[PDB]
Design a protein around this ligand. Structure first.
Ligand SMILES: [Cl-]
Ligand SMILES: [Cl-]
Ligand SMILES: [Cl-]
Ligand SMILES: [Cl-]
Ligand SMILES: [Cl-]
Ligand SMILES: [Cl-]
Lengths: 149, 147, 152, 151, 151, 152
């Protein structure tokens, strides 16, 4: 399990684009289960939408991407902050995205990603986003890990 | 239950000071149980503290005051959005608060409040704030509803 | 229906608001066919504080979002024309997103131009596909299916 | 020293925007008392939600400002003015008692903190005092906070 | 009235967060002058980038506050405290001149705007004055605005 | 010293940060003489929340700020070329603003182009004057004097 502090040392993302609060499950080269809490106290809700708070679907995808990248990175180098700073995880494609249920404040947005296939630095992950056991979204993504600036 | 939509119709608090996401239990003139999710994606963490996100203890208290306010608006006027939209809430007193465990991103901050006393618009309640079944804080407070 | 709309008009049709209204101006609009709009990218946006420190890159998912909002404007006005009163009773919902591909990173100073075309539409169901471009170059491409839903 | 400005507060207190609620220190006696203040203006984010059409500086933030006042007094009383030592320290609230709000604080108010040390041992400080506007008391509070090395 | 609080300023000026830069009106003489102020606190977003580790209220925002004060003066002089009519007008500023900055403004400062009508002909208002902190002239500037119909 | 600089470069020269860095890219630069730069204007900027609701207008005073920052970039690079270690120790202070005229309101979707020339300069004191332009038209005019000083 990894907490926000650990996440912050692996991912370069910061406020307000770090969308993973905690990692509950992690199997190298296999899968990951992480989540992000959804609360009203988030700036996005001011505009999406007034008097009707709905967590953006694209951000649910961004959350799945971040989880997948965290998976791809730790599988290769484990918990290594120094190496994390020397790498970039670039998302090339995203496909098969489907939104079934709206995520709102109060929900625990859980990400479930598994490694579909990986060769070299190219990693393809897929899975779902869930709230209390039900699939609220699904998607497949492909990332490329490379050397930073 | 009362979801955020409902909460917004009763409490006048708005971003970034509305600190209750959902109401799980309510019993007029008795008690209320609600909660707020804590995530890194909240502006308060930029300054509290950099590299060490800790949900402010005073905001935990504010969240309990708000939970008690909801119970007060409802015990008073039931769920009546139009009477509510004309009021605001003022903090009167806060006492006997203790912080046991720090609340952080990933935590589900559950509020437990019971009414200790009340007269007219002045309400006194007390209880705790809990994370995964454990008490992270205790407090008592008195607020006033006003036109 | 005109073919050019400014932020004043976008605000009357779309429900999105700060910081999630990612379309600044509509330059071309063909009912039931296509729309060409754009969003200016500037460092002065909160998103860059966290994506990323010292290296501002506009989130690929937001590029898609801007594409969806552009398509939503096209879908709505393709049916009711510029009608604020009705627009305020409808909300465009996207059900799917496919074949998204990011080719070039978008950065402050860029003029992110959205190019969406109507692949299929029946009733309130709209399927759109297209690209996001900067200086005539494709920076991303996507396909999305949306639903014109009732706000209440 | 007895007077300190925002430059000095920033070097001592760990708090940062939008949670640094002390703008200036007008006087302080080591291990004894500190007088400081925070300017309240409409141009502050909390006002968007507290409350629309009626800007009222949150009561719990006045308490927060008093605590930070105490923290500054605590830190300088232990290590004097030492930024390098202070940069890795954090401050945890332990308890809050007998607080009472008497007058709403609004934009244009100069919120003045008055804290006195009621007891302190090691990293644990118990301060007590008031928040004043135009020489009048708007709030009272007693609180215990702990200075801790960040780990 | 002679003194207007944030509540009143909100009903007269269209400006909102984070561009409403006047917190209270302490003096107001129809067609002659106005004295108002805005508190300066660290808890303001602008200090995040102007400048990190050195909070200095932007000079262009001091002029803005001065302009806002001039506008209130002009509007109230024509129709008094009338929120209803206020919503149908705009105070378009055409020129700014002779502005000099003497002392930087920092968190903890009380920025007091001192403006006076230099000329009023038809829908054109010319105002000038200074920004002061604790009796000291911090900035001066002249501004010209046009009263028009809100669209 | 080149004549085209991007945000990553501007970030390494000017001390300004969000939400007060109002220059996104430099398109032209002549040491000690002139500079042409620009800032993209988008609805997705916090300042529009209050200036004004339902009618986004980029504040005129912020246009002068942008002109000053472009000037600042000119001054720094003229003085020390592209030098991040030395620039990092400085800040910029406004001294005077003059002859500012606001001819056309700037709104989301506009590309605010700054055109400044060095009127006078000696040491850390720089005096510049020029215009702010949108699609070839003069949107604003201004003259200003600024000083570069150690953050001490
Ligand atoms: Cl959505
Ligand atoms: Cl705390
Ligand atoms: Cl991205
Ligand atoms: Cl309060
Ligand atoms: Cl300045
Ligand atoms: Cl303006």
């Amino acid at each position: 399990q990894f907490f926000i502090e650990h996440i912050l040392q692996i991912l370069p993302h910061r406020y307000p684009m770090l969308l993973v609060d905690r990692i509950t499950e992690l199997q190298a080269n296999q899968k990951i289960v992480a989540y992000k809490n959804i609360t009203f106290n988030e700036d996005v809700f001011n505009g999406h939408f007034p008097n009707k708070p709905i967590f953006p679907g694209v951000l649910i995808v961004e959350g799945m991407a971040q989880s997948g990248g965290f998976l791809a990175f730790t599988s290769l180098w484990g918990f290594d902050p120094e190496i994390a700073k020397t790498k970039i995880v670039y998302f090339m494609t995203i496909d098969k995205v489907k939104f079934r249920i709206p995520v709102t404040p109060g929900d625990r947005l859980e990400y479930h990603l598994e490694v579909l296939k990986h060769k070299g630095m190219i990693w393809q992950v897929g899975g779902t986003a869930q709230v209390d056991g039900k699939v609220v979204a699904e998607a497949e993504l492909k990332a490329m890990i490379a050397e930073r600036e």
